[PDB]
């Protein structure tokens, strides 16, 4: 089996992508977050506490006749960026581009913190990273992916995120027509539950490439590209204007600036992020004063490929036994 769905920006700066989703029977269509940095498919639902709900689309299970309370078992999840959300848990039928698994572990919330219910356009999330995270207790649960593998014709499935625009992530084959040039594999550590891998460097603009390997995830669940302060502080020395600030929290540049590029390496292949792409947008409304794509991750404690990163590629996640990452041009 394959699916197939397109996913689409929430707002004009791409902070996030949503892809709808079929749950239950009949089927309640969702636009969820589909985030490669965790492991948990959760959901708005009838249970979650009511003044937490504003514009969402919720699930609820009393009319799904697939639906089964999947007795005893809780989840309760906490995000990089400080939110969280936690509830009880149903088992159901769950489609994604026509691909279907049945009997997959939807998490219901009762409980979402503020920055989902202020978010109307995100139904949830599905978790695409590996599921030694999922917080399921007393049973942990399998990702969508996880329990889709074995029906797939090959086990993987792939990102290709567009910018300012819709994009596509597919599931048991990889579109050799999505792509430029060759797709480059490059090892994983399933070591933390991530899809971990290590960079071979970087350079700004058409400045010469440094070779230095910079360990970090593919997470299409986080918007920017987070990597060590010194390679951050070499990209917006070249923007005139550009400075850390404290207050906003981050990197800024004027406005009228024009970004270089950012390239990273895959093995001996290089992907270039364009200028513009990293380009968030005044810090506030009417600022002259802009928000950068890419931002230190010393006090995260881990390097992050976030969309900023992944949208200017055409990206493979491999499931196989071994599993491995894959990113061509496009």
Excluded: M
């Excluded at 079929?22 to 977050?33: C, K």
């Excluded at 599931?171 to 071979?200: H, L, N, P, R």
């Amino acid at each position: 089996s394959t699916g197939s769905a397109t996913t689409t920006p929430i707002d004009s700066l791409d902070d996030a992508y949503i892809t709808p989703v079929q749950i239950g029977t009949p089927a309640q269509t969702l636009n969820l977050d589909f985030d490669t940095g965790s492991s948990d498919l959760w959901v708005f639902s009838s249970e979650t506490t009511a003044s937490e709900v504003d514009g969402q689309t919720i699930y609820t299970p009393s009319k799904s006749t697939t639906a089964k309370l999947l007795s005893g078992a809780t989840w309760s999840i906490s995000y990089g960026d400080g939110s969280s959300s936690s509830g009880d848990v149903y088992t159901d039928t769950v489609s994604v581009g026509g691909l279907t698994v049945t009997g997959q572990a939807v998490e219901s919330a009762k409980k979402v913190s503020s920055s989902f219910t202020e978010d109307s356009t995100i139904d949830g999330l599905l978790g695409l990273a590996f599921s030694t995270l999922n917080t399921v207790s007393p049973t942990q649960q399998k990702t969508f992916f996880d329990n889709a593998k074995a029906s797939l014709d090959s086990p993987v499935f792939t990102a290709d995120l567009g910018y300012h625009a819709p994009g596509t992530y597919n599931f048991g084959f990889i579109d050799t027509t999505a792509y430029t040039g060759s797709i480059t594999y490059t090892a994983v550590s399933t070591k933390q539950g991530f899809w971990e891998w290590t960079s071979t460097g970087y350079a700004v603009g058409s400045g010469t490439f440094k070779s230095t390997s910079i360990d970090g995830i593919a997470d299409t669940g986080t918007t920017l590209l987070y990597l060590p302060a010194t390679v951050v502080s070499a990209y917006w020395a070249q923007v005139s204007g550009a400075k850390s600030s404290s207050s906003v929290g981050g990197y800024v540049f004027p406005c009228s600036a024009t970004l270089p590029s950012f390239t990273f390496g895959v093995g001996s292949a290089r992907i270039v992020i364009p200028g513009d792409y990293i380009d968030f947008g005044p810090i506030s409304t009417g600022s002259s004063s802009c928000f950068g794509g890419i931002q230190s991750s010393a006090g995260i404690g881990i390097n992050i490929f976030g969309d900023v990163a992944l949208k200017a590629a055409f990206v493979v996640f491999n499931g196989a036994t071994t599993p491995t990452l894959g990113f061509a041009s496009k």
